[PDB]
Structures are given as C-alpha cells and as structure tokens.
C-alpha cells in the first residue's frame, strides 16, 4: 500500500433479500491515506496493520503557497500594463463567495497531478452548487 | 535453547552509604529523549527507612 492512495468504503446495513430500505450500499466515507504502520504486542501473541487518512483535506493542507524573494522577471523595453505582474502575485476578484471560491479552486486544482491510472482531484471533487 | 537472565542492579551515591541505598531499590524509570530539551529519570524506593530526612 503506497501512500496517498484512495480507499472507498461501502457498508451493507441489513439483509439483501428482505427488501428493506437499507439495501442501498451507501458509501460511508472516502479519503486519502497518509500513514501505514506495523502494530503488535507479541506478549499477547497478536499483530495488526493500521492505516489512516483524511477526506481530501491532505492536498489543500499540504499545498503551501510559498513566497519567492529574489525573482525580477523583466523584459527588454517591454512591460505589463496591469500591476502585480512579473512577480508571483495573483489577485482573485468576484462579487460572491461562489465566484471567488471557483477562481481559488480552479487556479491550482488541475496542476496538482498524481499517478492515478484512470484523472485528478477535479474529477472526484465536484465543488459545484456553491452559493 | 532459551537465554537465562539474572539482573543485579547496583547504585552509587556521592554527596548515608550508597550500598544501603541500593539495597532498598524496587524500581526506576529513565526518560531520555532527543526530541525534547530535557532528560528526566525517576526512582522508586521502599518505605523501610525515612528517606525524607536523609
């Protein structure tokens, strides 16, 4: 189990043939693993493996928007009319949270690439219907 | 074959004789760690003698 893998869990509430309303295979939780470790107390003659993770909070939490101190990014006799250019400054504008949040998420989500055989976080996370 | 072990603890003290102090030993702990900026140990002693005055 390499780290950062995605695990989905489904729980069957009650019997299948009984035709109860619980027969829905509702997903209980999905998240990204971030730790695996051996566990065992050989005095008790028992061992176990424990895996833990978070529900898609790992990418945003780890992705830290750092600061670059000593980059000029000049051009010969050419400049950018809008200020805050050449440097890494990025400005988000909008008249509502759903407009601003869409720009914030859309700025960094597609480039956060991973080794999924099939896609990235955008396909899994809808982040729509915001108001 | 299974290993056989016979622990025998000795204690020395420098400012009561150290040997008498080590006789009444019952147990001790020694917490040493590089993660924190302090190393601390604890020693458990029997109630045969009044160590508070010594």
């Amino acid at each position: 189990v390499m780290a950062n893998d995605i695990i989905r869990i489904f729980i069957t509430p009650n019997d299948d043939p009984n035709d109860k309303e619980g027969k829905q295979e509702r997903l209980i939780q999905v998240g990204m693993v971030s730790q695996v470790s051996k566990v065992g107390s050989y005095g008790n003659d028992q061992t176990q493996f424990r895996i833990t993770g978070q529900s898609f909070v790992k990418p945003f939490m780890k992705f830290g928007l750092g600061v670059i101190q000593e980059v000029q990014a000049v051009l010969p006799e050419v400049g950018w009319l809008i200020d805050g250019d050449g440097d890494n400054e990025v400005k988000f504008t909008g008249s509502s949270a759903h407009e601003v949040m869409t720009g914030i998420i859309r700025r960094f989500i597609p480039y956060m690439k991973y080794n999924y055989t099939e896609n990235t976080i955008d396909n899994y996370l809808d982040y729509d219907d915001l108001s | 074959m299974r290993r056989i072990r016979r622990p025998k603890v000795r204690i020395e003290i420098v400012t009561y004789n150290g040997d008498e102090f080590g006789a009444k030993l019952l147990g001790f702990q020694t917490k040493n760690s590089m993660e924190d900026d302090s190393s601390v140990f604890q020693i458990n002693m029997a109630g045969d003698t009044y160590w508070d005055k010594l």
């Binding site: 833990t52 939490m61 670059i68 200020d83 440097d87 890494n88 | -």
Partner: protein, 66 residues
C-alpha cells in the same frame, strides 16, 4: 493517533489557529504607486500588494506620517 491529524506547524507540536494569522511585529515594503490627490500610497510586498482596493484614492488607502 487518529485525532492528532489537524492543522499543525513547527518541529515542536503547536496548535495552529487564528493566532498564527495575526502578523507579529513590523515588516518592510516598497512604494509602487502614490495617490497624489489624497497623498496616500500603496506599498508592494515581495509577492503581494497592500491596499489597492476598488476605491481609487479616498475611501481606502495607506496613510503616511505628517
């Protein structure tokens, strides 16, 4: 343990909260643009610009010593 997975920073364990958002101390910046009518400037951080709100010169700006 499982519950320890929260916001944290530093080699020693510290609970990151709204206190970390507050800026401790003073910082330097360079003057990029000056509103001559109100004589209130907007200063540029190395990768950010303070002020420069929708208000041109009057409603929001950085005062200057007199």
């Amino acid at each position: 343990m499982v519950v320890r997975f929260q916001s944290s920073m530093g080699r020693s364990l510290k609970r990151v909260d709204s206190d970390d958002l507050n800026v401790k101390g003073l910082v330097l910046a360079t003057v990029s643009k000056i509103n001559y009518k109100y004589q209130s400037v907007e200063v540029k951080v190395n990768n950010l610009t303070l002020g420069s709100r929708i208000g041109d010169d009057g409603s929001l700006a950085v005062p200057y010593p007199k």
